């Protein structure tokens, strides 16, 4: 069976095809946008049919700086998708294989701005000829990342604050069950305080924060709060649970969400994988564990990855 997207210009004079609209990024390579444009030559007597891919950083200020632009001429001038579309359309169809290069930012929609990809196609007799709404056909497409196939190390981290007014410090350890969390799954913070000071642990505050680097933007997306006190010369151990989700995050204007075609509901933006070891929107999350003291601070942070699984 299989299905493919079509779109046309108001003139009904031009027709375009794609077989997907989410094109995956493997960090080591990015997939091609391999589509087929069907032409009506006679009405295309201008005789230069162009196809264009574009990565618009239409971020607010408002402005627009096109981070990446690609051009290809289809008429006058193959993957299996190309070949089957060409065979389906018979004769008067010509292809278009863009290859997005590595290192360009992911499809990101700031909560109403952001980065989105735009396949644009038209016919003319020169590239300098003016673009007009009567002739252009456009498709907004997405370029996204799935969670890694292999687990990393446990995101353990620690600290120790030798208070000057005390002989022995407040040793502390925080760890998550795993560094990868899928969307909708629960987080598990293992807080293992081992206090030896005269100060009293009043207030354990647990939060998951979004680090949107747009080329730093910080905002707490999940939050836990407890009066799990720790007594002087006493130890403590509790597994806190949290889960980031969009319900209580609507009002937070600006938070990065998964790229959207028109306006559909999408989850909080999956973490971006960096190439090996960058313009656009870079987003990452960390769990922050904060302990108030009194006799009023300590804290340790935990980088974790929040990303979708690869579809089945």
């Amino acid at each position: 069976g299989t299905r493919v997207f079509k779109k046309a210009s108001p003139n009904g004079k031009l027709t375009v095809y794609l077989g997907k609209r989410d094109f995956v990024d493997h960090i080591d390579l990015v997939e091609p946008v391999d589509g087929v444009v069907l032409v009506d030559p006679e009405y295309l007597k201008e005789r230069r049919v162009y196809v264009t891919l574009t990565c618009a950083f239409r971020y607010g200020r408002t402005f627009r700086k096109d981070l990446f632009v690609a051009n290809v001429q289809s008429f006058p001038p193959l993957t299996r998708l190309q070949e089957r579309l060409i065979k389906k359309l018979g004769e008067h169809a010509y292809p278009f294989t863009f290859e997005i290069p590595p290192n360009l930012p992911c499809s990101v929609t700031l909560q109403p701005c952001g980065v989105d990809y735009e396949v644009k196609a038209f016919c003319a007799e020169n590239l300098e000829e003016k673009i007009h709404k009567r002739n252009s056909v456009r498709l907004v497409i997405r370029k996204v990342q799935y969670a890694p196939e292999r687990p990393g190390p446990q995101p353990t981290a620690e600290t120790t604050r030798q208070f000057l007014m005390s002989d022995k410090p407040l040793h502390l350890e925080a760890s998550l069950d795993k560094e990868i969390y899928y969307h909708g799954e629960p987080i598990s913070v293992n807080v293992h305080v081992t206090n030896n000071t005269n100060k009293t642990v009043k207030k354990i505050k647990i939060s998951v924060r979004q680090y949107a680097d747009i080329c730093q933007y910080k905002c707490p997306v999940a939050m836990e709060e407890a009066d799990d006190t720790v007594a002087p010369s006493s130890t403590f151990c509790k597994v806190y649970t949290l889960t980031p989700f969009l319900a209580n995050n609507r009002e937070k204007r600006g938070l990065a969400l998964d790229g959207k075609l028109k306006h559909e509901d999408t989850n909080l933006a999956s973490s971006t994988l960096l190439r090996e070891g960058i313009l656009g929107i870079i987003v990452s999350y960390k769990v922050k564990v904060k302990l108030v003291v009194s006799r009023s601070d300590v804290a340790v942070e935990l980088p974790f990855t929040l990303m979708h699984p690869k579809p089945k």
Epitope: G1, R3, Y182, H183, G184, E185, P186, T243, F245, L246, A247, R250, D265, N267, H308
Partner: antibody, heavy 117, light 106 residues
Framework: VQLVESGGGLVQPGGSLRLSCAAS????????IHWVRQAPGKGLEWVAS????????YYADSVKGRFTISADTSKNTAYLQMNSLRAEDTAVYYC?????????????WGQGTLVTV | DIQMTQSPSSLSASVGDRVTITCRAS??????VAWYQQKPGKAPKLLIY???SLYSGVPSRFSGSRSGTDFTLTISSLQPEDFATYYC?????????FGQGTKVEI
């Protein structure tokens, strides 16, 4: 991974009843919880559904205004506050669960409870 | 709101026979169609989703097929455990709608 329900019983029409849906092996934020009701001798019918992740509650017009769907966040359990019951609301009432990311058919159903008016 | 007329409502089939169920919608709902099985008294269970894909653990004789708006569930060889009532479901729009069911008998 399993769903189990209870709470059905004989009810005085015009009264109220609550069905409950216990979930094991998953969570209310990564999944969507549905109610499907089956009157005796008849086929299935969607009643209501909640996606706790987004804040969306959905209902059918055959039960709109009376039935209320909600979920207990701390214990993964769904509810159905059935106000103002009427005769045709007699059915076997099932809980259903489906994926939030992304809905791909109702995979986990419990055996449900029989509600009679 | 999408009506989902389903037919036939009941059919006779011996073991090893071929059975096809047709679910016809009042609109295109893309390929958003699911199929469920229900033995008498038991909870419904998913068989086919996205109108062609097979759910984890579902036997290989269950299959889905689409032609425009005539979504179809095809059972390759009816085993004695398959006798039940089958329900089609669009899930592209709210209010979500189920078919009237198709029961199978010997």
């Amino acid at each position: 991974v399993q769903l189990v329900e209870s709470g059905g019983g004989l009810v005085q029409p015009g009264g109220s009843l609550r069905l409950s849906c216990a979930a094991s092996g998953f969570n209310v934020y990564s999944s969507s919880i549905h109610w499907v009701r089956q009157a005796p001798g008849k086929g299935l019918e969607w009643v209501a559904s909640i996606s706790s992740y987004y804040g969306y509650t959905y209902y059918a017009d055959s039960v709109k205004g009376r039935f209320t769907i909600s979920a207990d966040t701390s214990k993964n359990t769904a509810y159905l506050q059935m106000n103002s019951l009427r005769a045709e609301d007699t059915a076997v009432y099932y809980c259903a669960r489906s994926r939030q990311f992304w809905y791909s058919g109702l995979d986990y159903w419990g055996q449900g409870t029989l509600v009679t008016v | 709101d999408i009506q989902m007329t389903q037919s036939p409502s009941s059919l006779s089939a011996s073991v090893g026979d071929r059975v096809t169920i047709t679910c016809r919608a009042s609109q295109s709902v893309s390929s958003a169609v699911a199929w469920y099985q229900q033995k008498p008294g038991k909870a419904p269970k998913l068989l086919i989703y996205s109108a062609s894909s097979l759910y984890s653990g579902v036997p290989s004789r269950f299959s889905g097929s689409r032609s425009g708006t005539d979504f179809t569930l095809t059972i390759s060889s009816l085993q004695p455990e398959d006798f039940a009532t089958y329900y089609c479901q669009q899930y592209k729009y709210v209010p979500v709608t189920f078919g009237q069911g198709t029961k199978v008998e010997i």
